[PDB]
From Swiss-Prot, chain B:
Subcellular location: Vacuole membrane
Alphabetical list of PROSITE patterns matching this protein: ATPASE_ALPHA_BETA, INTEIN_C_TER, INTEIN_ENDONUCLEASE, INTEIN_N_TER
Mode of membrane association: Peripheral membrane protein
Family: Belongs to the ATPase alpha/beta chains family.
Protein name in the entry: V-type proton ATPase catalytic subunit A
GO molecular-function term, one example from the UniProt record: DNA binding
Residues recorded with modification Phosphothreonine: 108
Subunit structure: V-ATPase is a heteromultimeric enzyme composed of a peripheral catalytic V1 complex (components A to H) attached to an integral membrane V0 proton pore complex (components: a, c, c', c'', d, e, f and VOA1). Interacts with RAV1 and RAV2 components of the RAVE complex, which are essential for the stability and assembly of V-ATPase.
Swiss-Prot record, chain C:
Subcellular location: Vacuole membrane
One cellular-component annotation, GO: fungal-type vacuole membrane
Coarse class of the protein's main subcellular location: membrane
Gene (name only): VMA2
Cysteine pairs bridged by disulfides in the record: none
Residues that coordinate or bind ATP: 122
Name recorded for this polypeptide: V-type proton ATPase subunit B
Keywords attached to this entry: ATP-binding, Hydrogen ion transport, Ion transport, Isopeptide bond, Membrane, Nucleotide-binding, Phosphoprotein, Transport, Ubl conjugation, Vacuole
Organism taxonomic ancestry: Eukaryota, Fungi, Dikarya, Ascomycota, Saccharomycotina
């Protein structure tokens, strides 16, 4: 423990009279006011060292401050007692419970899965949504994001997902999830709390909550704690592990904040240059392990700035994670049930859960055909809105009514109402039945003869 | 250790032997002891950024550091006192210095130490266990509100030893001597709290308690509960001042904290002159609106640190009033000025900008300022309930929503009520867009309003759907024609045109339309819904539209007069009129 | 600024401030800011320019207890004929109202080219009316401005379908626009006309339209003015 400190500038710290410091090492900072703030090591050069303060350098004396350096890397007290108990972004109990006994002490950084040890995506699941089933399939253990807009029902729709998840999934042992928030709102915190309470999974799930009132470092560290926790659940606990992460936008802006605070050379749109890899840290951790029971299924949620899907946040999100489920502001103001954008939304593996032996052979072709009719309906909607109602072809009006019906009926089911995959396939066959016999060019003869009543 | 300026580059000054001082800490620079703030610190030489004029400060002048950050004085003598961005009285500066200008480096107390007050011990004796927030006594402060509760400051817990209550004392006198684990300690009636740290509370809660705006449209469409958050445009000449003043006077909150960032001289002077002119309407007539409220004013010539962080001080005072267990409200004028000042501060701190000239801490500062509010229970033995309602205005330079201020305002505030200049140019009441008005507090407010059986939500959503159908009808009227529609469409269009006159529009100049009670607005919406429903029912009864419109004119004239005649003590008088509307249905069954 | 300040708070006299070529003072302020060898901001301008103008335009106002008041009306050249300019954007939200210049009116060989659309003043509410300027000021100002605007709309509409399609209000606005442009707009080089001459020329030029052709006029005004 070195009681010597040299400089302080902005939200950072520099100490001297030390040697052999570790990269991203846990360091305890005892201030002059008696305040104990946790911090991580930034860099180490010779007899000089530089570290970053999580709680900030605000209200700290230069020569009156003492620091105890553990020297070990980033360390978290993971255990099996985390289920049912709530934890904060700082790791401290927010549930006002007693001291949690740690089963194992492991780095929150997370370990990249070996390629040969990586197992291919398989099986399937029922999210209770037709769009989370038909249009874009969701594999169990796979990784798919949710791109929403500010003010939109991101928290509510995600709540529908987390609530209907374990209920519907069995139709394809209850499913266990993990809730994670980084620099999130108090209103969204109350909404998520009431959602997790209503689902009754609060006993079977763990929550890591970092409030917006809390520091940015805690928000960035929340994702790591969730990564190690979900990893411990999908490997050590050998149970089905759902990973729910929220407020990625806050962690991104905070990342830009930390990147600028060090005056580092920024990349595109002011974010970090390692952003691809920085996101890939927790992004590529999802998957299945051969021979090891359980899996980590990543269902992240991010908010595009100014409702722009062309934003660098969403672009980097698609560049990191494979596939995404879009929430458009176009359909959110239409008043219909939750607004999924058919074009932008796509699945990582939609070919893994299809075909016979998994669910049915009527799934995939119907997805391609329905997507075709919907897109044709959109282009025909633009053409109809341009020239006129008598200036459009027969296929234009047919696809228009088909897309309108697909939006009013198929797209609109409910949040607390979980539609089974079979109901999705039936309602889809009935929606496609609205179209003519020569309408679907993406469908096979057998399925066409079979689906028509 | 006393600092000495060894370097001066522009407004920034670096002083050696300042090692004792901390980061982001206030300091007195030069022989004049001018107000300044320490930015960085390198060894024994700290780099400080003076918010005041750097002219006159030379080398060899000892610089004394406060050793701590920027703070403010909460307690008695604070109310009925104007303050600046630096939390300093302009009236007392003009009274004392007797000058038309404000000297750089001058210093005066925020709270008056020359004011003697009569205090009395309420619920605190010697030997009783108390903590931060626990009431140590009661002293009458304003001429409007009840005696201001003086409580033992935060991070102080022990057994009381020497009580100076009851008795008459100033703000510089210690009103208590507390014995803690650290033995003997001194406590006063006045306290000092950091401007960057929000006031501590016992437990946090969600605000289900609705705040009365006094305006009909404000309480109906986009209602802001006490503790809730509301946003609007900062456009000048858009009539924002009228809505703001009407909101502050008719507020259901106990106190109001007004914090400006920066603006033209005419606006700040107009507000400064028109502030004290308002009178109370509680106990017949108490004091002025300036007495039970706090004002912090900073012009454009004021420092940028006194702008972006002024909202922090105002929110600190408002939360301090919310720490006393009273529902309050925080009003912020021209937040875009505090944002641009935060941009200049971003240029002054060397922080790399993010987008459109905004700083790096943009989202963090906005979220920190928006999350400090709300309704909660303050700490201490007192266990009093309180609230702080944040209300902000964003005035982007280009007006574009792509600006940081706009996206942050729309994102942070859960309720957004837009003010369109064209809407005020339509020769109508207070300017609000019927299409773009939205609030996220609708669910909780509706569920909470079901307790008092005051249910707007049904009639609110219904009139919303009527306004939307009328919007489609308006879109069709400019497409095909106004004479080609059906009876239902005509009834909806007429109801929409009527709703924009006798229902939505409420003149603050009149007696009964200045502040419309909950019963007044509820009865107005109920009577309107009764008329529209009676018309819709009469449409299916076989009555002609013209004959109905001619015969039911009396019901419309009677319903239009429910906005006047003062006091709502006789709401039942309106109910009879509603029955008369039903009688129109009986009149529709004849002709 | 100190010179105007000395004649207000101390000498107590009515003062008026005028700044010429603020663009050159902005480039000068740019060289002066670069004198600190700092990396310049957007388009080669200091980020503290908001405060730089804030210590400038704040020198104008009326003082309580002092008879002498100082008023300032600066002048600035918009860069490359663009209103997006940092100068225009800085003085825009700061100053009250703005007086622009129409390049069309200056290049058509006419008098002072202040575009009627763009011309505005925030203190216009306190500078007119009975006892201030005239009772015929505001209403007729709005009526003449509306006449010029609707006259321009009619100028474009007549440039479309021709002059045979000219309507009542259309032709009225055509004459009103032609007149307001070739007469009302025309002032002089050294010429200064009294406010009374302005109100009289306004009522007389607006007299070309009938009494009901102006919906921008009040009844009391129309009965107590038109003669």
């Amino acid at each position: 423990n070195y009681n010597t400190v040299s400089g302080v500038n902005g939200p950072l710290v520099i100490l001297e009279k030390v040697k052999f410091p570790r990269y991203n090492e846990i360091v305890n900072l005892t201030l002059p006011d008696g305040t104990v703030r946790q911090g991580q090591v930034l860099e180490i050069r010779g007899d000089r060292a530089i570290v970053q303060v999580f709680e900030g350098t605000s209200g700290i004396d230069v020569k009156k401050t003492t620091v105890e350096f553990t020297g070990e890397s980033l360390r978290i007290p993971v255990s099996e007692d985390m289920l049912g108990r709530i934890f904060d972004g700082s790791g401290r109990p927010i549930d006002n419970g007693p001291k949690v006994f740690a089963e194992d002490y492991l780095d929150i950084n997370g370990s990249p899965i070996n390629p040969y040890a990586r197992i291919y995506p398989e099986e399937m699941i029922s999210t209770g949504v037709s769009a989370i089933d038909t249009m874009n399939s969701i594999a169990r253990g796979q990784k798919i994001p949710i791109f929403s807009a500010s003010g939109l029902p991101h928290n509510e729709i995600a709540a529908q997902i987390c609530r209907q998840a374990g209920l519907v999934r069995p139709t394809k042992e209850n499913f266990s999830i993990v809730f994670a928030a980084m620099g999130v709102n108090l209103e969204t915190a109350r909404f998520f709390k009431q959602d997790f309470e209503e689902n009754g999974s609060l006993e079977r799930t763990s929550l890591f909550l970092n409030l917006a009132n809390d520091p940015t470092i805690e928000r960035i560290i929340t994702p790591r704690l969730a990564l190690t926790t979900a990893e411990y659940l999908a490997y050590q606990t050998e149970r089905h592990v759902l990973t729910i992460l929220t407020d990625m936008s806050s962690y991104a802006d905070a990342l830009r904040e930390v990147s600028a605070a060090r005056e580092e050379v920024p990349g595109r749109r002011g974010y970090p240059g390692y952003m691809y890899t920085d996101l890939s840290t927790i992004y590529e951790r999802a998957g299945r392990v051969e021979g090891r029971n359980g899996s980590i299924t990543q269902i992240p949620i991010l908010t595009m700035p100014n409702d722009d899907i062309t934003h660098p946040i969403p672009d980097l999100t698609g560049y990191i994670t494979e596939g995404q489920i879009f929430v458009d502001r176009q359909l959110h103001n239409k008043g219909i049930y939750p607004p999924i954008n058919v074009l932008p939304s796509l699945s990582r593996l939609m070919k893994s859960a299809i075909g016979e032996g998994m669910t049915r052979k009527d799934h995939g072709d119907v997805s391609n055909q329905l997507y075709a009719k919907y897109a044709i309906g959109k282009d025909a909607a633009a053409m109809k809105a341009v020239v006129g109602e008598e200036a459009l072809s027969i296929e234009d009006k047919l696809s228009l009514e088909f897309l309108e019906k697909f939006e009013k009926t198929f797209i609109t089911q409910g949040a607390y109402e979980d539609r089974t995959v079979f109901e999705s396939l039936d309602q889809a066959w009935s929606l496609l039945r609205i179209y003519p016999k020569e309408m679907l060019n993406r469908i096979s003869p057998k399925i066409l003869d079979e689906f028509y009543d | 250790e006393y600092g000495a300026i060894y370097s001066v580059s522009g407004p920034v000054v670096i002083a050696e032997n300042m090692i004792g001082c901390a980061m982001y800490e206030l300091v007195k620079v030069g022989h004049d002891n001018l107000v300044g703030e320490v930015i960085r610190i390198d060894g024994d030489k700290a780099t400080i950024q003076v918010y005041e004029e750097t002219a006159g400060l030379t080398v060899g002048d000892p610089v004394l550091r406060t050793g701590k950050p920027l703070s403010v004085e909460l307690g008695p003598g604070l109310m009925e006192t104007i303050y600046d961005g630096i939390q300093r009285p302009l009236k007392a500066i003009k009274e004392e210095s007797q000058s038309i200008y404000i000297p750089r480096g001058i210093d005066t107390p925020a709270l008056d130490r020359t004011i003697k007050w009569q205090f009395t011990p309420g619920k605190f004796q010697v030997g009783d266990h108390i903590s931060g927030g626990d009431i140590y006594g009661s002293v009458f402060e304003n001429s409007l509100i009840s005696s201001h509760k003086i409580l033992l400051p935060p991070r102080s817990r022990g057994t009381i030893t020497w009580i100076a209550p009851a008795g008459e004392y100033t703000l510089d006198e210690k009103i208590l001597e507390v014995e803690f684990d650290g033995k003997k300690s001194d406590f006063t009636l006045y306290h000092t709290w950091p401007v960057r740290v929000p006031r501590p509370v016992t437990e946090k809660l969600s605000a289900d308690y609705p705040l009365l705006t006094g305006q009909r449209v404000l309480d109906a469409l986009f209602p802001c509960v006490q503790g809730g958050t509301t946003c609007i445009p900062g456009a000048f000449g858009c009539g924002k001042t009228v809505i703001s003043q009407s909101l502050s006077k008719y507020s259901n909150s106990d106190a109001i904290i007004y914090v400006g960032c920066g603006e033209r001289g005419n606006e700040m002077a107009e507000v400064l002159m028109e502030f004290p002119e308002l009178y109370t309407e509680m106990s017949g007539t108490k004091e002025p609106i300036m007495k039970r409220t706090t004002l912090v004013a900073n012009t454009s010539n004021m420092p940028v640190a006194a702008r972006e962080a002024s909202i922090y001080t105002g929110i600190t005072l408002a939360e301090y009033f919310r720490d006393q267990g009273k529902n309050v409200s925080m009003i912020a004028d021209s937040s875009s000025r505090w944002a641009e000042a935060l941009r200049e501060i971003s240029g002054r701190l060397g922080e790399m900008p993010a987008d459109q000239g905004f700083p790096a801490y943009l989202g963090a500062k906005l979220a920190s300022f928006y999350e400090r509010a709300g309704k909660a229970v303050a700490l201490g033995s007192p266990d009093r309930t309180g609230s702080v309602s944040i209300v902000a205005a964003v005035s982007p330079a280009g007006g574009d929503f792509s600006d940081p201020v706009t996206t942050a305002t729309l994102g942070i505030t859960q309720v957004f009520w837009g003010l369109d200049k064209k809407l005020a140019q339509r020769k109508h009441f207070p300017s609000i867009n019927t299409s773009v008005s939205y609030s996220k507090y609708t669910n909780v407010l509706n569920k909470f309003y079901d307790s008092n059986y005051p249910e707007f939500p049904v009639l609110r959503d219904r009139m919303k759907e009527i306004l939307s159908n009328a919007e489609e009808l308006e879109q069709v009227v400019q497409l095909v024609g106004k004479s080609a529609l059906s009876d239902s469409d005509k009834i909806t269009l007429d109801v929409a045109t009527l709703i924009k006159e006798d229902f939505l529009q409420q003149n603050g100049y009149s007696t009964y339309d200045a502040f419309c009670p909950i019963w007044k607005t509820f009865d107005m919406m109920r009577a309107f819904i009764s008329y529209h429903d009676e018309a819709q029912k009469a449409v299916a009864n076989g009555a002609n539209w013209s004959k109905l419109a001619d015969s039911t004119g009396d019901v419309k004239h009677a319903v239009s007069s429910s906005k006047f005649f003062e006091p709502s003590r006789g709401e039942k008088e309106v109910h009879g009129e509603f029955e008369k509307l039903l009688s129109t249905m009986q009149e529709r069954f004849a002709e």
